[PDB]
């Protein structure tokens, strides 16, 4: 059966043949309680102490118990269970080519990475999960150390030169849809440039940026509070158009125009913005080692090995022991070995043949320390570091948690209508909530004046 | 559209004509794809198939070599349960 | 796209990697989450102690 | 009076997220229950459910 199946594709052999021959059987959870299942065929069937000797079934591969996001984790059994769960949750937030036909889609919020490389160490399960074709990360030369100090409490130090060359560079797309419709017998919307005369209700922003049709042309600069569509409603006209959200800033990619189901002019416009990795961006490897870029140094400032190889990322060594994520270290070592060799390695969870000693023995056959440690140099003064830093390739990702999408301020912004108090939400330009817990904290401090200023002066003064 | 028309029409001649038109369209599309992918798009698939074949044979030779070199297996970082 | 070739999928502005199996209502991709419940036609027995019954067989 | 969240918007942020959301499950138990027996990973979820992929908030 193995050979007839290996010679598949070319002929016409499939899983139905095995099911029909009677080599595989679909067992459910209620029947699995009455079978003597086995893990591996060879190990659990030779001749040792009579443990059972009455096996009825045998799993294909133990690692198969893993799911989709938990499968991409290399060496998941070498880590703690909480970090594997955190990684399965963060893997869904990784950026990259989410779909091959992204230039046709008009979805809202879409992040596409420029150079999504493939993991240097891929499990034998992602081959079917289809992660190698549409990856979500780059293999970076990570050096576990405490270089300057900006990576001491779950933070990283990226290489400015690598970012310049195009290290985890991505583009973010934001779409905007707008359809005209018949509000009432006398009310009616139409796409048209709201001039400075006929239109009464109008915003204090630029309007000549768009063409006469009212739709902004592709490949045009746009900033916050810039008109993107020319919707005017006849009362003579009120500017009922939409503007690019504040703090957006980008360039128009394309514009689509059609007729919705109702038959009115419906347009979609997506603006792209190239997000250069800056400090504050959230990163995470395949083991739950989440972090934020603290500071970025240039290649001249970053350390360097005996040859021109500066680390691209520097995590916090203190983030290793407490979390017990030795799978990450094993991955880095195997990635160094794979890059020196010339082929992707295996990181299957249960393999009985991927230990650390053998990987170290292979690595030692290339001029590197069997354990992966290497001698660096203080990039600033150029002196050797007494401690031999542990540097090697490792696959990192980039989450959509940008620093620009979260920064927010306020200085007497808009107010609600029910209770004249600040709005809520970054999009609506709202203020932060001074919670009851903050009230109690201020009470404990004894700053009644500050407390009243927060809950009255800068909240909702009224007489 | 041709497939839908052929499935909807019950006449034998109409079905045969629709099948012939669909076959001609598919052949033309395949010829255009081949002419467009004669370079790069086809070389990449060729290298991929030969590389997966090379990987399969590499794995098989590694497995047979591991089965052959069964002299001794004394290692430290490894263990297995043993009930009873 | 029932058993269509990757060629036609690409010609129709779609990719063969899309797992599919999601609705498109009002232009949005809708996916149904598999809900779970107690298996019907099976008799369970529980011993709720915060009540007047010592044991309870449910069907 | 009916359920909520049975049909969600397919998260098209990356291929892994699309696949996960298509193969996701959901329990009907009330949100934030004082009990702690239904959240724990039962031994029976071997080869049937991913023992690691799961949120970390209230659900």
């Amino acid at each position: 059966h193995i050979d007839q199946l290996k010679e598949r594709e070319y002929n016409n052999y499939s899983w139905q043949d095995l099911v029909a021959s009677g080599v595989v059987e679909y067992i459910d959870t209620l029947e699995e309680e009455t079978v003597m299942l086995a893990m591996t065929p060879d190990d659990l069937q030779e001749k040792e102490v009579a443990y059972c000797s009455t096996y009825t079934h045998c799993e294909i591969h133990p690692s198969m118990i893993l799911g989709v996001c938990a499968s991409i984790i290399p060496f998941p059994d070498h880590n703690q269970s909480p970090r594997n769960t955190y990684q399965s949750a963060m893997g869904k937030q990784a950026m990259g080519v989410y779909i091959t036909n992204f230039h046709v889609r008009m979805d809202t919020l879409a992040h596409v990475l420029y150079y999504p490389q493939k993991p240097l160490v891929t499990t034998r399960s992602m081959e079917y999960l289809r992660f190698r074709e549409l990856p979500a990360g780059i293999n970076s030369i990570v050096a576990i150390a405490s270089y300057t100090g900006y990576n001491q409490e779950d933070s990283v130090i990226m290489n400015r030169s690598a970012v310049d060359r195009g290290f985890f560079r991505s583009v973010f797309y934001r779409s905007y849809k707008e359809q005209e419709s018949k509000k009432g017998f006398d009310q009616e919307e139409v796409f048209e440039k709201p001039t400075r005369e006929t239109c009464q209700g109008m915003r204090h922003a630029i309007y000549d940026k768009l063409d006469d049709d009212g739709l902004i042309a592709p490949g045009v600069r746009v900033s916050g509070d810039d008109v993107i569509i020319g919707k005017t409603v006849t009362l003579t006209k009120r500017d009922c158009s939409t503007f690019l959200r504040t703090s957006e800033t980008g360039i128009v990619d394309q514009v689509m125009v059609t007729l919705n189901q109702e038959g009115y002019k419906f347009c979609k416009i997506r603006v792209r913005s190239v997000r250069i990795p800056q400090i504050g961006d959230k990163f995470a490897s395949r083991h739950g080692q989440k972090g934020t870029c603290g500071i970025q140094y240039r290649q001249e400032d970053m350390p360097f090995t005996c040859e021109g190889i500066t680390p691209d990322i520097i995590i916090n060594p203190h983030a290793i022991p407490s979390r017990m994520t030795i799978g990450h270290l094993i991955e880095c070592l195997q990635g160094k070995v794979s890059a020196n060799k010339g082929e992707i390695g295996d990181a299957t969870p249960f393999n009985d043949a991927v230990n650390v000693q053998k990987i170290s023995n292979l690595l030692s056959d290339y001029g590197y320390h069997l354990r992966g440690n290497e001698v660096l140099y203080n990039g600033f003064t150029g002196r050797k570091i007494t401690s031999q830093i542990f540097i090697g390739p490792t696959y990192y990702q980039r989450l959509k948690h940008m620093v620009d999408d979260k920064i927010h301020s306020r200085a007497r912004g808009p107010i609600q209508i029910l209770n004249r108090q600040p709005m809520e939400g970054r999009s609506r330009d709202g203020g932060l909530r001074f919670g009851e817990m903050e009230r109690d904290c201020q009470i404990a401090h004894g700053a009644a004046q500050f407390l009243r200023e927060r809950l009255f002066e800068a909240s909702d003064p009224y007489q | 559209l041709k497939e839908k028309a052929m499935a909807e029409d019950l006449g034998d001649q109409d079905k045969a004509k629709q099948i012939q038109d669909q076959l001609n369209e598919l052949e033309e599309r395949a010829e255009a794809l081949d002419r467009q992918r004669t370079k790069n798009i086809s070389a990449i698939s060729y290298i991929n198939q030969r590389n997966r074949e090379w990987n399969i044979v590499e794995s098989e030779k590694a497995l047979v070599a591991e089965s052959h070199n069964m002299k001794n297996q004394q290692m430290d970082p490894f263990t297995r349960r043993q009930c009873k | 796209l029932n058993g269509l070739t990757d060629r036609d999928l690409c010609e129709l502005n779609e990719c063969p990697l899309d797992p599919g199996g999601y609705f498109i209502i009002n232009g949005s991709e809708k996916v149904l989450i598999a809900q779970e419940k107690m298996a019907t036609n099976t008799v369970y027995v529980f011993a709720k102690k915060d009540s007047k019954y010592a044991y309870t067989g449910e069907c | 009076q009916a359920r909520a969240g049975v049909s969600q918007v397919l998260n098209r942020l990356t291929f892994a997220s699309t696949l996960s959301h298509l193969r996701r499950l959901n329990s009907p138990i009330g949100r934030d229950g004082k009990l702690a027996k239904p959240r724990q990973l039962h031994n029976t979820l071997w080869g049937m459910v991913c023992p690691a992929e799961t949120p970390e908030g209230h659900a």
């Binding site: 193995i2 594709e9 499939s14 | - | - | 298509l22």
Partner: peptide, 28 residues
């Protein structure tokens, strides 16, 4: 003939065939 030892490679041919026959969203 039984396949002793030499099984780490045959163990994945069956998985490959299963995934090629049935997709990931086959249940839906």
């Amino acid at each position: 003939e039984i396949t002793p030892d030499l099984w780490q490679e045959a163990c994945w041919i069956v998985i490959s065939s299963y995934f090629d026959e049935k997709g990931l969203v086959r249940q839906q």
